[PDB]
Amino acid sequence: FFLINGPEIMSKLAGESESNLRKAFEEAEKNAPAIIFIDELDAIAPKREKTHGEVERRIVSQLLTLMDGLKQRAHVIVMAATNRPNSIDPALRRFGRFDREVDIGIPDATGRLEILQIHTKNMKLADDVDLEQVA
Amino acid sequence: NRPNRLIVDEAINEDNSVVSLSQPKMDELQLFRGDTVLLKGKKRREAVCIVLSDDTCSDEKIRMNRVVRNNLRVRLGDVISIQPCPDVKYGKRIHVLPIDDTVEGITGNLFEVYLKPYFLEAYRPIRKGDIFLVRGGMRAVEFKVVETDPSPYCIVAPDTVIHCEGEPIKREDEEESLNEVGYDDIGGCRKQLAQIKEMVELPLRHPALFKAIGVKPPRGILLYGPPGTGKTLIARAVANETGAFFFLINGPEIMSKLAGESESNLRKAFEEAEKNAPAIIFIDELDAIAPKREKTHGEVERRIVSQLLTLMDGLKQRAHVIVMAATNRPNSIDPALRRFGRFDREVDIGIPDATGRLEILQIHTKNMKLADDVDLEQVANETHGHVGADLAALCSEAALQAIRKKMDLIDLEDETIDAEVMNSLAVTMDDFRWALSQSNPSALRETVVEVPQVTWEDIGGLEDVKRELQELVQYPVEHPDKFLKFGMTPSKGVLFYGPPGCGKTLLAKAIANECQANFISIKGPELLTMWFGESEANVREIFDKARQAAPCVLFFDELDSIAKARGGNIGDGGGAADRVINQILTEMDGMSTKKNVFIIGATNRPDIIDPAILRPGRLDQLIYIPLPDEKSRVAILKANLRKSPVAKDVDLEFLAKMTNGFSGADLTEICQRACKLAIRESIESEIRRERERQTNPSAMEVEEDDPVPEIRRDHFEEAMRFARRSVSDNDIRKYEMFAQTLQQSRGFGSFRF
Amino acid sequence: NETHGHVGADLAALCSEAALQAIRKKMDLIDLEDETIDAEVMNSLAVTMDDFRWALSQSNPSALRETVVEVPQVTWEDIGGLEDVKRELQELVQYPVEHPDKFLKFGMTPSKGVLFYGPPGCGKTLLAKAIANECQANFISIKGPELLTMWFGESEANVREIFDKARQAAPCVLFFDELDSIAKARGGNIGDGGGAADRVINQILTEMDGMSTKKNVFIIGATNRPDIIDPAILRPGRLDQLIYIPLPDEKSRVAILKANLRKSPVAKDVDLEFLAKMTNGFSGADLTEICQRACKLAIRESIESEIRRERERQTNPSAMEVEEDDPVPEIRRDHFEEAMRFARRSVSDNDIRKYEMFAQTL
Amino acid sequence: FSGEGQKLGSL
């Protein structure tokens, strides 16, 4: 899983970040049926719709070219870890515009006790405490 | 067209190079029983075989075996042209290689010791590049023709020296060759496809036609539209069909850190394509290449734009050099490129129609059978018309549902997948239905929000109004032909006058849930913005998306707060509200498609309505939603009691007569109050039972938990004594004033005799 | 002469397109020619004046292709009413352009025309579209969201681009929308966006008052009522010339209703005369709405009849082919009367007074 | 993979 990073999207050179991202994608694909740990997924969010940043626009174009075109369906897939889906734009919302159609994540309190159960089981800290009951 | 393209029927004989031809076929065509003719297949698939004379095994159709179809990459019944192939001589040094996926298991020299006589004095005029499975070593070893010293169709004989190495061909190349590109997700783009072919095939297959025409075709052709919806697929299909060099050009490709690297790369690519062949400039993702050199604050970007213009717009620059330009944002087009000379041609890719939707969906689904008893055309017609890879998404969702059903009946099957169970594990219309119910338009997904489910039947009262709305929705779609025959357009601006939220917003939600088409809900404070013109731009974008998202429903909820007249107070402030109203009118007016403009009007105060959009055309009708009659009261009561446990001691009619002046919100409140009283009573009973059980051994499994699962008549009486109707006589007066305005605006029926 | 808009290699491109269309027709009707084409057909591949005309009608100016998109075209004849106004507009379009001798004899330049105080809702946009389709010349029409942007000076750039495009493609009339939304004075909406929008409006006026007085630079304006529009630059020193419009009528209403019916499946038993008589105080949008309601009732009746026929066929497979195809091919006079009864007028007396006062403000 | 370099399957 080639870990992405927002800082990796920055290039003091000309197009170096986009070329480097393309090279990383190619290296991961040629490496193995690897994964694409797409981190900071909400970085180029708006598909440069209202964005005036040409470097940002160039990055979006390179990202779409990686996500589309010939042999886009490699033996890898990316993670749409979206901080804000409204910021995100349809240029990835299509099954093929990105890896797929993305879901959303949110917390629940009933399952939180199970999450609380895991957190408590991480380190023993109570015996007679009805920790699940209180949670 | 030509009679030489005979239908490729199925051959009973298992011989690969033998086609059962009718006596009429062997006679009308120069087709002897031993004539080595050449057959041309898909994507330049040419091969030479023998034509068997079988009149009883062919009726104007070339009976072809499945091996022949697989080798030629053709289906059954295909109109394949057949031409004589007498130039097939013995190859000098033909390179051969087995297939790794097919030579896996056949040990030893499974070519010379298995297919020995298959090529020795066997007159095998196969194309250089073909793979044929050979039954050798109790298997089917396929050897791919690596190369041939002679031309592709070379007669492999004992004299022909078949060069052979130990290179086993992996099945990945087999899949890639099977991964051809045609009309599988493209339905209805006949005009664009024809234009492209004429710019290519007619340009190539009839170059003399262009020469006699005294004019070259458009070397620069632009492809606007939503990309990757098949746009990338369109480029792939072109490249697969195209025999000339396809100089694929990515967008962020030439831009490099070194000085002038991008321009040098572009010039090098152009020169290489020119010296290579009558190539086509496959400029992929060319949309983000230049902002018309006006907003191009980047000097490197400006230089890139200038170099691109010089290469494209240049004297004697594009000789037999087409420019496959693809655009995702036609607005983002550069000024010079949009003109002829830089891009002489330009095409915009539109969304497909329901018929084209069905065609593309069936073509995509041709890979599998996910419903043996269901027609995909039926669902596609039932489909709203989500376009692009929406069909692919629907297919994937149906596959996921089928996999859920199968692996639900199966184990993890990490290594032991039951092939018989895996063999067409699920082919279900129910899977497609579940996918579609779980499916929605991806474009509006960012605007999509979760809404409660309610049926048009689940809402009580206003049966005439609900029926009218449903008919308006259906007839506009269901009987488009009837509208064409009548020759009239439908209504858009349906409003609602009365106390909203009494079920009003609930009515809108129930309609949207019961709506077969899309629905876009608009909040009153939703589109406001602080940046200069940002709110108006947002409104314009929403309108444009809705127009693209046909069919859709403009649920402009809380339109009262957005529809204030320009100057409803002592003065206006900011003026952007007037700009928003003007932009809405530009959406509400103007010559365009407006294919499914279902504008939903919700306003509790009709006086807060700007007349301009309230005007006809800009507005269709307003639903003067009154309070419920005792009959309507009983209807709403029954609708509420749908999920409630009913008590026979409750006089619903007596209440409805008593609650003549009440409201649907009031009725819901009374129901909630009775439910709360019952819940409190149940909680108290449970507490008392526990306390008795706390102090003494007592039974727990008793029906006392629900002493009255139905509504206690005492609870109903208490709720009645609690509150009453919230209808205001002044509010009634205002509503009646709006109604009287409408009525005086109306008049008696014509009844002209 | 017709190809006023086409410039540069645009004419050659149009000729190539005409040749392509004609050759496509000739070959497709002649032969697929997957291998070779007939030399007789090849020598007989001459284009036709009809083919050139068809392509040119399909063709459009190169800058407009990058500028504007298409719209539903209508015929000036297809729209009834304002016959004198239509004649004046057509004269201004042609005799000032199609006749240079008229300009020489008169000398007077074409009037700018400020804002047609037209019907409030029936849409002067309808008239503008019908004229532009009839005009066969460059036509500019934009909405108010055209220039307002979160880019400093973006509106000024948009105005400059519009002016330059008009200069390139003169003559062209700017059928700009949001007439009231731009005509409002600097004050009132205190403080708007700090006056930057007002600054852009003032610059555009100066860029257009204020525009180049050559090549028949024209503009087209209209509003539901002129009172919403402030005459800040609409004064005939900054708006150059002015042209208003009236509200709808009764005889013109009958004419427009007749045109709409002619566009659709007409009926005889309908009392069109009494309908027009009752239609003295209505609007053309109201007539279109009545027509749509009647059509909806007819379609509902047809659907109900089809449902009954299908139910009978299912219940008895003998009545499938024993039904008339069009239960009401003409409009049911009962349906028209019912639609009228359910209908109401959009005429507002207070709005009429306000519009007249705005006209009276002249 | 090679052409005319290995001894071939003589018949």
Residue numbers in the entry:
A (entry chain C): 266 to 400
B (entry chain B): 21 to 773
C (entry chain A): 401 to 762
D (entry chain X): 215 to 225
Sentences from the paper on this structure:
The AAA+‐ATPase p97 (also called VCP or Cdc48) unfolds proteins and disassembles protein complexes in numerous cellular processes, but how substrate complexes are loaded onto p97 and disassembled is unclear. Each subunit of the p97 hexamer contains two AAA+ ATPase domains, D1 and D2, that form two stacked hexameric rings enclosing a central channel, while the regulatory N‐domains are positioned at the periphery of the D1 ring (Zhang et al, 2000; DeLaBarre & Brunger, 2003; Banerjee et al, 2016). Most prominently, p97‐p37 regulates the biogenesis of PP1 holoenzymes by disassembling a regulatory complex of PP1 catalytic subunit (called PP1 from here on) with its partners SDS22 (also called PPP1R7) and Inhibitor‐3 (I3, also called PPP1R11; Weith et al, 2018). Disassembly is achieved by threading I3 through the p97 channel which is speculated to strip I3 (and SDS22) off PP1 to allow PP1 holoenzyme formation with activating PP1 subunits (Weith et al, 2018).
Here, we have analyzed assemblies of p97 with its p37 adapter and the SPI substrate complex in the presence of ADP‐BeFx by cryo‐EM, yielding a set of structures of p97‐p37 during the disassembly of the SPI substrate. The density map (and EV2A–G) confirms a staircase configuration previously proposed for p97 and yeast Cdc48 (Cooney et al, 2019; Twomey et al, 2019; Pan et al, 2021; Xu et al, 2022) and conserved in other AAA+ proteins. Both D1 and D2 domains of p97 are in the staircase configuration with subunit A on top, followed by subunits B, C, and D in a clockwise manner to subunit E at the bottom. The central pore is filled in both ATPase rings with a density of an extended polypeptide strand that is engaged for threading via interactions to the D1 and D2 domains of five p97 subunits (A–E). In our structure, all N‐domains are in the up position which brings the substrate complex close to the central p97 pore. The SPI complex on subunit B is seen very clearly as an arc‐shaped density enclosing a globular density, corresponding well with the available X‐ray crystal structures of the PP1‐SDS22 complex, in which the leucine‐rich repeats (LRRs) of SDS22 form an arc around PP1 (Choy et al, 2019). Surprisingly, our structure shows a direct interaction of SDS22 with the N‐domain of p97. Closer analysis of this interface revealed docking of a short helix (aa 337–346), located C‐terminally of the LRR array in SDS22, to the groove between the N‐terminal double Ψ‐barrel (NN) and C‐terminal four‐stranded β‐barrel (NC) of the p97 N‐domain (zoomed‐in view). In our structure, there is extra density on the p97 N‐domain at the SHP box binding site underneath the PP1 complex, which well accommodates the p37 SHP box segment (Le et al, 2016). Of note, the UBX domain of the adapter cannot bind the same N‐domain as its interaction site in the N‐domain groove is occupied by SDS22. Instead, we see a UBX domain on the adjacent subunit with its N terminus facing toward the SHP box peptide.
